[model samples]
Target: MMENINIVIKDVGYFQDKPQFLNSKSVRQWKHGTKVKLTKHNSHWYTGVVKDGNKSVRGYIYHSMAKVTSKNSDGSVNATINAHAFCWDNKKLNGGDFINLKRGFKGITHPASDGFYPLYFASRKKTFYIPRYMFDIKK
Candidate 1:
């Protein structure tokens, strides 16, 4: 079950906590394939002005200010992705708007691939889970 699965973000050592245009500077050179589990997160909102126009939507990713995960492979803790404080592009706001087990490193969809997969990091070799309330999902 998902409750037993923990998400991992490969090659995340690069963006530990440096600010940039949209997300943390850590996002620039991160492991590119180094994976970290989604241990916890904080939901924040940002105003993005895209071709469609400016809009606001609450997005959920970990806080770039903290260690995404313990960097331990013992399964003693979970992992996370800290996208800094960025707005949710409507185009990437589908499938519940929060991270899930099946959707790691892939950027929020099946085969979560965002410049880091077979090209950067290998697919998650395992799985873990967070509580339902952790995401504030509607019951």
Candidate 2:
């Protein structure tokens, strides 16, 4: 179930159709404080475009960069994406690549190749290409 909602961009990032880093092509980059309307969600990624539809540009963004500002009666959170905002893609899992699972570095699963499974970590100020196996996606 999806609903229309407004979101505010907190960081500068790019927007794309696909959520994957290499697989997705960026429409453009947006500046911080920009507002957009979220159209859809794929895992942790959200798709959105500008409110005025001035550019008619649509793209995908990570859930972390934008926050929900719209109120929902169903208690659903709506998010929007901007081109200038950071986007990440989930790809094949890699082994030996360390990740913070319990705030501790958890070893990777399968090794990742060039530009596979890249995720931009804002707090650490670094992008990590981790495998999907590294995370336990709970429903």
Candidate 3:
């Protein structure tokens, strides 16, 4: 129940009941554009709450399968690219560094295409691109 953040599935994804992959104890199928809020995470997965038919469902999402997105109290749409942010776009020649963005990093998301996404930081009014591997989305 700490550092809660909002996110959306870019495409098809699943919700696991436990943080461990083998737990398969419970699972839920979800699609893109669904409203979701994450509460906590471990090394392997993020645990959160989801909106289901006006009710709420609690579950887990494996890393790299979700993106960071949320709104500030004043309604500023605070969102992040694969940083939930990492691995800057190809403009940087170094292509193999694995930048693992923390689960709740903040940014204002922009267009997603060609395996990269652009995000703007409102505070600094900065825009940067990151690889899809970091802000992973699957169809």
lDDT of each: 0.28, 0.46, 0.47
lDDT (10s digit) by residue, model 2, range 1-139: 4222222322345465666544456464555556666644765677765434555656676665456778456544554433222223323421234342321232222234553444545566655554332232221
- Candidate numbers sorted by TM-score from highest down: 2, 3, 1
Candidate 3 lDDT, 1-139, residue by residue in tens: 2232233323344466766433244355455444555644666566776566888867776656556576446532322223233434344513433344454444444545453456554444445555443333322
- Global lDDT of model 1: 0.28
Off by over 4 Å in 3: 1-11, 50-57, 71-139
> Which of the predicted structures, 2 or 3, would earn the higher TM-score when compared with the native?
2
Question: Could you say which candidate leads in TM-score?
Answer: 2
Worst 10 residues of 3 by lDDT: 1-10
Residue 2 CA displacement from its true place in model 2, Å: 50
Comparing 1 with 2 on TM-score, the higher-scoring candidate is 2
lDDT of 1 at 76: 27
Tens digit of per-residue lDDT, candidate 1, span 10-122: 33322323222233322233232334443332242111111214643222233442344464465323333332222222223222233322222322212322411111123
Error of 3 at 74 (Å): 13
